[PDB]
Amino acid sequence: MNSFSNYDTKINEISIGLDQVASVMDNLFNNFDIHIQSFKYLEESLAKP
Amino acid sequence: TVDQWAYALSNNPDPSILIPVAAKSFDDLINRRMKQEETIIALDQNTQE
Amino acid sequence: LNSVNEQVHLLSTQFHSPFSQARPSKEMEIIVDSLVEKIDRIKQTILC
Amino acid sequence: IGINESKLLEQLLNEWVSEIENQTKNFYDQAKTIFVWDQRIMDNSQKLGKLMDVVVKLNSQQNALNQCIDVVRDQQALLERSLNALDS
């Protein structure tokens, strides 16, 4: 009984890590379409000439 | 008992995917606490990767 | 009798306390103060 | 501890009853604390899983991006080719 660890620190740290991964993931989707729309404009720019 | 097991089935938060398990000493508690630390270490390692 | 019997028991469950017992243990703090009280009993005997 | 030989059995029984009710309390509060850690670990595990279902979508966006890069490269490599074929 007297040898019971707490673990809420590790379970906070993992939660915060999973919010950092979510924040990077949504940046990654914006950074994906910023490139994909940029390359689409380079195609329409060629299509006429 | 049968009465104790009827309670274990009637308070299960999802009977579709969860099995009820008894603990009856601090040995049973820590035979599950060490598996929370086992799961915490694995859950961090897949979050960091 | 009590304190020897608890360390005899902790070393029988094989239980690594995750809060490791503070170092040195509080009975070693008390053993060193038990040497002081004998030392000062000798000083107060010399002076008598 | 070995029981002290001077103690009354009445004292020893009341001492042990008090300690078993102290241990009964702390067993339920420690087990309740373990149960809160189950949910926090299970919800963080569900959070990680639902992000992995979206890593599969990032891999789809890289294939879409690679296709745009392949198409613009050879639209440019066809424009140079048709300019050389007009110029000549």
Answer yes or no: do A22 and D62 touch at CB < 8 A: no
**Rounded to an integer, what distance in angstroms lies between the CA atom of residue C6 and that of residue C8?**
5
What is chain C's alpha carbon radius of gyration, rounded to the nearest angstrom? 16
Task: Name chain C contacts of A2, Cβ cutoff 8 Å.
Answer: 17
Q: Which residues from chain A sit within 8 angstroms of residue C17, using beta carbons?
A: 2-3
Alpha carbon distance C43, D61 (integer Å)? 85
Please tell me which of the candidates A36, A42, A43 has its beta carbon nearest to residue D64: A36
Residues 6 or more apart whose Cβ sits within 8 Å of residue C6: D1
For residue A35, give how far its alpha carbon lies from the nearest alpha carbon of chain B (Å): 25
CA distances to B42, D37, D39 from A11, rounded to whole Å, are: 12, 8, 11
Q: Which residues of C touch A3 (CB under 8 A)?
A: 15-19
The structure was resolved experimentally with cryo-EM
User: D61 vs A42: CB contact, 8 Å cut-off?
Assistant: no
Considering only CB atoms, D44 lies closest to which of B26, B29, B43, namely B43
- For helices D9-87 and A8-47, give the axis angle rounded to 10 degrees: 10
Which residues neighbour C15 within 8 Å (Cβ) at sequence distance 6 or greater? A3
Determine contact: D26 vs chain A, CB below 8 A: yes
Selected residue of B17, B40, B45, B49 to mutate for chain D interface (largest D Cβ count, 10 A): B40
D9-87 vs B26-48: helix crossing angle, rounded to 10: 20
**In angstroms, rounded to a whole number, what is the distance separating the alpha carbons of residues C24 and D29?**
30
- Cβ–Cβ gap B43/D48 under 8 Å: yes
Rounded alpha-carbon distances, angstroms, from residue D55 to B7, B16, D60, D67: 41, 28, 9, 19
Q: Is C1 on the interface with A (CB under 8 A)?
A: no
